[PDB]
Design a protein around this ligand. Structure first.
Ligand SMILES: C=C(/N=C/c1c(COP(=O)(O)O)cnc(C)c1O)C(=O)O
Ligand SMILES: C=C(/N=C/c1c(COP(=O)(O)O)cnc(C)c1O)C(=O)O
Ligand SMILES: C=C(/N=C/c1c(COP(=O)(O)O)cnc(C)c1O)C(=O)O
Ligand SMILES: C=C(/N=C/c1c(COP(=O)(O)O)cnc(C)c1O)C(=O)O
Ligand SMILES: c1ccc2[nH]cnc2c1
Ligand SMILES: c1ccc2[nH]cnc2c1
Ligand SMILES: c1ccc2[nH]cnc2c1
Ligand SMILES: c1ccc2[nH]cnc2c1
Ligand SMILES: c1ccc2[nH]cnc2c1
Ligand SMILES: [Cl-]
Ligand SMILES: [K+]
Ligand SMILES: [K+]
Ligand SMILES: [K+]
Ligand SMILES: [K+]
Lengths: 459, 465, 465, 465
């Protein structure tokens, strides 16, 4: 395992504390054995998500302080529009308060657009893998969310360069089965969060887009972790060995018609989202009409001016290769600590998190008992580390998936490699108990995005 | 007119500038004679809205710096829950990114909740006056938005204590006509923004709530400007002359079952919203289920932790009587400068804005040529001040005929952000409008260069005639 | 009286409050009847000083956030060096933590420099008027501080354009009497704080410098309020009617060899100072050698990097004519409110404060009973406004006699921080002082309960008579 | 070597960069082969000092935002006074802009106090080891600075628990030689910076103070790194094994009469200093009288209010044992990386820096050719890391002879700012120095191009040989 030094130094700290074992047991009981319902005061190192927990730079805070809070025509709106043109070559933007706000703006518009001419009676979205909010918005609008990630993603220990790729054979099969007139959009998720933060190759994005254009299908790039994807393309595709990260990004967005983005990920923010559209003015106009009631007026989109300002700066910082090398290298370091100790993980590690394969760590659990959640809860009790489940629990409707990950999710520029060692050493310490204590049931199950507020029972 | 001194001093400033007349003429032309299309760089004093443009305190900024950005279980979420219990006596909260986010969380839930009982067959919402976003959410969910403000609100020049009140007679006529089965909720808007920021009396809130309950009707308090409403109750209702602002607020919320709030108004924020529910845990659970896909996880609701932190502090600051007296007194000062010069306004002034009645200023301009927009544009060209139209332009066309809907009032709204502008800025505004008195009679009406089929007020491009 | 609108809007506020009358009486007694010993919690509007109490801009706070805290070679040091070259055409800088630190760096070096040449046998400094800290440093180094302001400054009610001017006849007389060999430096104080914030004309600065150069005498510009001085030159000297403020500043600094600056004044800071030297590298090197033990390493001079960053930005903002017009216009407004009501002031008002002439206002209180302090204390008890004395109390006792020094000027200074208070705060101050019209006669003097052997106005305790 | 995890997480970052070898070559030549003259833009990891380069907490920044900038009576002054009473049990405070400002306030006052008693005819100060600014103020006031650290400090490789201790035999010998009447004060430096950041035991502080009291000698605690010293006492003195850090601090300050503090060290600030006096009100009063001309008014002492606020919070954070364990553990980690690779260091490592013994690394370079500076320059060219010399270059010339003063130790100090760098930064530092092991034997010394007569290490220009 190799430690890579921060390409920055620390300018402001935030205190953390280790709650006592008694506190942790009490807190997990009070939370119904669901870490989503734990208070932050009961958590030491928080690995629930890399979303919105990032550390900003002094330049981002400075941008916030001079942000323009105007209701209409904020300076920072125009700066953000210019930044989207620079990075993606897209001519239209709509800010949103975060990624699922961007989805709520755009997906219903794309559906109604497709329903023109009386077609799309059996509407579907197709993705390498829809994230949970993404699929929820697809289904809330009466559509099916189809996932067709490469089968290589399902072999955790076997290395592959591009475990986020679309399965192209399945893309063509689904077009033939459903018909192009029923495919509202193809969603290219970069990196592929559900597969383990695994990258999509440039050739895969390109072929998917060429197929989509053959059939007149609109392509949306789900862009929360687009810079991590671009880094992997530079690292693993020899064609881009000597390209800049921004050159890689520019090419990626040749292979979509629009993007939805949670800027709470790679743009290094605590809040913020974005819709950008390459050149379809009609869809832009319709999306603006939905933005107004759902998010806010179209030049702030549910964001304070200071957050548009932070986003303009964060979009730049998130592309910096030295930063990306360190960030992705820290995730790799945590994974290598675990793998060298015999802990099974999705290999190679993705951009933002280490995905621990609990199907191999705890094969004696079925999806009936959510294997990765029993691991997560045991780790929390042992160490005060909070992680999150990316398996049957999150996928929804006991529908068992093809992956049962515990996601040790790593915020950007927050934790050191000594925090990583603490995480790894704590889990490595659980090895005599992975068989003892095990299993979980439901008490309360929401019908949509159940994992966030459900209460569970062990056995 | 009386100037009331600030109960604070200035700690940080932001430069503003007056573009040259040549630059203002070019900018208005480029914006299609629609100030909503102007960049902020072309605006000197911005009176488009009081929403999200407020100046925060040093304590609010300090709260932001120590805010907890945890995705689940932020320290500031629990502080916000405790604050809602303190102020409103409500037991459940869901943060939202702003007021229309709170509406999107709660209103669909209220409709489905009533549909589930075999009711809401032909559903409606009733308010003293639904704000634009509020009505849009009512209509997006297949319901009609019925507004029944007191008739006193339509006599602009005649003083009344409570121009935001519900018309109780119309409330009963609408209940008889639609039946309680079809009334998804009553929305008590405090202050009543669309009537001119005018207050709703305590006795009116109470009587509306009593009628609603006797009919099984859920009541939502639209609370963006709840502190300004509380101030007017203390100022004008003898029974509350010696009450604290917080005591007034506590009584107000005895007369709703829940609240939706834009915290971009009275809680002195640049972003933020809130749903609070008094004690109906089922509705709270259903609203949480909608919050997750639309806004965010239920302990941040689409806000950064720093903004929940700022909201907890701003909720306190927005109740402070010395601040409210100064804030509402500044609005009154602007109004009295205008009224004393013969400019007709909605009288008395409300909490957050002066509404200028443009019918009388430009009688050569009929309603379908947007008299208030012509005055706003002349004001901008004269001074760099940007105001907003609450008249025929905003009102739109009648779907049945395609013709301009008859505007009951043609208002220019001079909307005042909190703790941002001084009374010398107010004088600049008033002097600019007063100085146009001779020009009013020769202002030209407006027609459409480009009219969108919806939301024309925001993006339509206009031409002088 | 004319109110001039702010060329900015408020972005962050800070609460203030009025202590009750009972609290003000108790507080003044505990402070030994010296407002310098009052806590800020006992003060409503604080007019003790314009030093370090200014409101910064969002750009200044942004500059602080990205400031370089390096001990050696901070980015912001080089930015500050460039800014001094831009504004003054001076090639060398040494930051200092504030103005009296700059004086402590430079004045002992100028003395030693004059001595190493075999001169300065009986050394003196000459100024239009040395500020208190400035004179203290002159005297701590064994020199006499000679003040030779124009006699026009002593006629408070009679308007003059340049009440801060040197008396040129007295300058020549003092050089002839003491000898050029004994004049360590001439200090041109701009504006002339002790005369009432009153400007020095360009022609006066030039003549003083020309005389100095003919004699080989070094000239230091005491530059705390250099932008206010530049504004008055543009306003009152027809030669500069169409010059920019920066053009005026550039010309001013042709008439010194170095500057000492409290950046807590016109550069709009809460802390900060500066030495700049035009081109004498030997004096620069010697000043750096004193900086190291007294202030800090030579690239931060006792300041955090963020404060050098704020100074770079504030130096720019402090030169902006729109801001200066408003700032000086607010001081003028307070002065005109008072003068129109018959209160005697130093007329015209200076840049930063209204100086109320208390010899005229309370002639029944002898100088050694501190007439201006009796007014100040009386104003504080009546209103919670804290002002400061610039008269006998500040002046102290004569060493040769042990008795009170006779003062030419007996001012109560209403000192105005920059961008902090509105003109409605000014009205509060004026109305409070005007309301004391009838009590002015009954005002007692005061007597000492304990007197510092030196620095009595900062730490002494008083009792009424 | 053992890595200790941060008891915090990162909330804000600042970009750093490795200049190219070409850039480093050009920058070092321009800086005259003296890293003190490098711009920070030429430095990758800056180990010049732990003074003022620390990372603050969100709570410290929040305290700054609400800081009271009042010239007299700031809220934060009273908070700081209370904090000094809590931590030290001292009843009087004077803020200062930084540590050498506190020295400038207090040391001249202690001399005058001893002189007016008829004493101090041939005055000296005695310390375990005076830091260079501290000795400079002693000498500037006409006194001799006597250093009497334990001889154990000069055996770098041999462990000892208390390498900062006073040599008690030498203390009694110096009292006998000079006489108590001539000893103005004893200065207890904690930790002993010049000995390698090495701690002073509680029993040593106590015996020194008991000896001082026997003879009527005033004791000052130089307290820049008092929390690091307290940590070492808890770690190494069994009497305090179960004491809190604050309990250790409280006992330490039973053994002084006053303190001078650079708050740019253990209180985790970028600027700030402090004088505190236990109970001698006369010395407090005299110190206040010097504060006014040199630093500022007595309730801010040359600091912005926001910096007094940050100091109140940092004083608390600097005592937290979990933080001290990590901070001191990081320094020990760097030291163990070096020592495990055969690089000689002062062992055990102290609180704030690793001191590399270059007398052992480059024996072929004599002291007057600055062996430690040769190592420092090689490290900079190899890696972009800037370190500082604590050896013959710093020590300077004997004023009697004009030749090199003999250095008892030739240290390269790798000084670590608090909460700024990670242990992976430490690995970069260590790997860079370890990779030079074969180059050391052929490094050449340095000679002068420009040499100040007083403090040549801060500004001298050198050339290789
Ligand atoms: C919350 C995270 N994900 C959000 C996300 C979203 C939704 O973004 P917001 O959380 O900003 O609504 C959309 N698309 C992808 C690929 C995502 O990963 C997370 O992975 O924890
Ligand atoms: C934008 C403003 N109003 C918002 C508003 C809203 C919507 O809040 P947001 O703008 O925070 O979505 C809801 N209810 C009332 C009574 C309102 O006044 C405005 O009046 O300009
Ligand atoms: C403190 C103020 N004056 C400071 C000052 C100083 C001393 O600056 P500091 O207060 O920053 O040390 C020097 N020269 C002049 C002309 C000054 O006005 C005051 O006028 O209240
Ligand atoms: C600058 C550091 N030392 C400052 C210092 C000082 C002087 O403090 P200021 O740098 O804050 O003036 C006084 N006493 C001790 C023991 C010190 O270590 C340093 O060690 O690099
Ligand atoms: C894991 C954790 C939090 C999330 N919020 C949205 N999707 C998520 C996945
Ligand atoms: C197997 C194959 C290729 C790999 N690249 C990195 N680790 C690997 C393991
Ligand atoms: C005026 C100003 C802003 C608005 N946002 C929504 N409706 C509005 C009316
Ligand atoms: C008046 C006010 C503040 C001062 N600081 C130093 N001298 C002063 C005189
Ligand atoms: C090394 C580094 C910085 C210093 N400041 C004062 N003496 C020093 C020695
Ligand atoms: Cl109906
Ligand atoms: K967040
Ligand atoms: K806003
Ligand atoms: K200050
Ligand atoms: K610093």
């Amino acid at each position: 395992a190799k430690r890579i030094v921060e390409p920055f130094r620390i300018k402001m700290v935030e205190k953390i504390r280790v709650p006592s074992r008694e506190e942790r047991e009490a807190a997990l009981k009070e939370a119904g054995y669901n870490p989503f319902l734990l208070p932050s005061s009961a958590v030491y190192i928080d690995l629930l998500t890399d979303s919105g927990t990032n550390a900003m730079s002094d330049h981002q805070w400075a941008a916030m302080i001079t942000g323009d809070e105007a209701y209409a025509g904020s300076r920072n709106y125009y700066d953000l529009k210019d930044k989207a043109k620079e990075l993606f070559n897209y001519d239209y933007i709509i800010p949103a308060h975060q990624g699922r706000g961007a989805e709520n703006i755009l997906f219903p518009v794309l559906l109604k657009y497709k329903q023109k001419e009386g077609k799309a009676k059996n509407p579907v979205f197709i993705s390498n893998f829809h994230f949970d909010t993404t699929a929820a918005h697809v289904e809330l609008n009466g559509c099916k969310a189809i996932n067709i990630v490469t089968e290589k993603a399902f072999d955790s220990e076997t290395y592959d360069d591009w475990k986020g790729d679309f399965d192209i054979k399945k893309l063509k099969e689904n077009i033939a089965q459903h018909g192009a007139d029923n495919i509202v959009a193809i969603v290219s998720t970069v990196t592929c969060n559900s597969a383990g933060g695994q990258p999509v190759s440039m050739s895969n994005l390109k072929e998917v887009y060429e197929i989509a254009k053959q059939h007149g299908i609109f392509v949306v790039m789900d862009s929360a972790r687009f810079c991590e994807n671009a880094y992997f393309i530079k690292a693993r595709d020899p064609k881009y060995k000597n390209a800049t990260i921004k050159e890689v990004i520019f090419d990626m967005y040749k292979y979509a018609d629009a993007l939805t983005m949670s800027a709470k990920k790679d743009p290094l923010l605590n809040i913020g989202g974005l819709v950008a559209i390459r050149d379809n003015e009609e869809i832009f106009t319709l999306a603006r009409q939905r933005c107004v009631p759902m998010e806010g007026f179209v030049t702030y989109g549910g964001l304070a001016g200071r957050d548009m300002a932070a986003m303009v700066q964060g979009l730049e910082e998130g592309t910096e290769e030295e930063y990306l090398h360190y960030r992705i290298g820290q995730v790799k370091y945590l994974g290598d600590r675990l793998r060298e100790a015999g802990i099974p993980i999705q290999y190679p590690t993705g951009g933002h998190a280490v995905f621990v394969d609990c199907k191999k760590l705890v094969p004696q659990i079925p999806g009936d008992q959510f294997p990765a959640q029993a691991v997560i809860n045991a780790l929390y009790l042992e160490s005060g580390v909070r992680a999150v489940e990316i398996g049957s629990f999150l996928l929804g409707r006991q529908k068992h998936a093809d992956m049962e990950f515990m996601r040790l999710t790593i915020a950007r520029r927050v934790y050191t490699n000594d925090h990583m060692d603490y995480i790894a050493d704590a889990l490595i310490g659980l090895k005599e108990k992975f068989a003892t204590l095990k299993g979980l049931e439901f008490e309360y199950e929401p019908p949509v995005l159940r994992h966030f507020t459900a209460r569970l029972k062990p056995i």
